[PDB]
Amino acid sequence: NNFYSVEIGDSTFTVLKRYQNLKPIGSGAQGIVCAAYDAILERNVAIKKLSRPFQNQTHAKRAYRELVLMKCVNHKNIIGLLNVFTPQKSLEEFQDVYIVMELMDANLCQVIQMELDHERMSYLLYQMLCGIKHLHSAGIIHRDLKPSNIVVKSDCTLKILDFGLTRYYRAPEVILGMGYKENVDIWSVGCIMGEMIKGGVLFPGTDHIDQWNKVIEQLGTPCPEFMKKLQPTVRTYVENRPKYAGYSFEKLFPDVLFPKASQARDLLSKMLVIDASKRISVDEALQHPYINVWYDPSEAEAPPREHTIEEWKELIYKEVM
């Protein structure tokens, strides 16, 4: 009676009366998302109905992780929570979790291929990095940034859609089975940037092995010191490819491609480094002359197991409440 129902395909959305004009815009394994107008905040929102949160402990933990990290994490460059709710009135009746977020206009897939000027390119990248830096401060390393999970509005603002864990934006650490650290995210930012400057996917591997070869064909075969860090099985393969020299970044990104171009190149040459121990950090990328132009300390320096289904249910119910 605070709630009403709309049918979205085979699924029923029961939502607060403030949320009108529901139109489905997403449907994965994680859940159905509708766009919607919020009549109280007088703006557009995205409403996500969680796919079977208590079906099992895999779903239960992921839903818990989503709920808590969205509550606590708070930054203009990260999709934040506007609201959460359930239409059910008691722990016993509890079934469905609705998360409400700001509605963004687009993802980066189609935008990045339209040649942006430096100002916009650098500003978008400055934004991503402030978002990543904030995620990293909360102990969240994403591992899976790509055009599809970075969202923008027509006012050139930008947010990171989700909290992570198309293999084209995966770091070599992830592609092989090596450990990773914070700067695993720098790689994904490196691919995205290169793409902006070039106009198409940097490393379009047709499979989890061709991804490697695409990378080395352009960047050169990594050091034998890097090879020693690999698992035996992957090292026997990788170590026995033909040796690639790679091209210098001047060749990989010549003045010809750009709308400053020298600065963007130096940065790229520091992000797309295969060996992560030699790859630039988030903080060093924020201080880079190509990115530093926008620096604002309020943006680039802000502040930060075992259960059964019935326990998870409660834990989630309380978080809704």
Partner: peptide, 9 residues
């Protein structure tokens, strides 16, 4: 430098 305030979708 002025922060861009438009983006073409």
């Amino acid at each position: 430098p002025k922060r861009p305030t438009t983006l073409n979708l």
